[PDB]
Design a protein around this ligand. Structure first.
Ligand SMILES: *C/C=C/c1ccc2c(c1)C(C)(C)c1cc(N(CC)CC)ccc1-2
Length: 133
């Protein structure tokens, strides 16, 4: 479905460390991020999205409109300027982040009460699965 609204609880998270390493996240902070529980909250109304990723020590919040390029500064992650764009490819929500890193972005598949997320940077892919709370 194209409806990603909800509070999403993590079920699985594969190659999180390799993806963070591809983004040049500090080794020390990688070890903490691997242990912290992540909650993904999405509010979606038509084209307008508000995404909030929350843990004990780190938060990542982004708002965007589908189809409208936006300047992004990943201040709480790798601290880079990218040109971001989120679009629908069938029922897949696709985000491309143009900048220094190649193949940078994510894709989201909503299958019922499950959300599959693949985050990419360089030759690394992190695969996450969430269940709607
Ligand atoms: C559709 C999902 C997009 C998206 C963008 C940014 C982040 C995420 C998802 C998370 C939840 C995977 C995430 C986690 C983190 N930290 C760990 C590296 C913890 C907050 C940062 C950014 C994003």
């Amino acid at each position: 479905t194209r409806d990603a609204n909800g509070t999403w609880e993590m079920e699985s998270n594969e190659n999180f460390e390799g993806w963070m390493k591809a983004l040049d996240i500090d080794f020390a902070l990688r070890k903490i991020a691997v242990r912290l529980t992540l909650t993904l909250v999405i509010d979606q109304d038509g084209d307008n999205f508000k995404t909030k990723c929350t843990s004990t020590f780190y938060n990542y919040d982004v708002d965007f409109t589908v189809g409208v390029e936006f300047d992004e500064y990943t201040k709480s992650l790798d601290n880079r300027h990218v040109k971001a764009l989120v679009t629908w490819e069938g029922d897949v929500l696709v985000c491309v982040q143009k900048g220094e890193k190649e193949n940078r972005g994510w894709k989201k598949w909503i299958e019922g009460d499950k959300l599959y997320l693949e985050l990419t940077c360089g030759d690394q892919v992190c695969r996450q699965v969430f269940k709607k709370k």
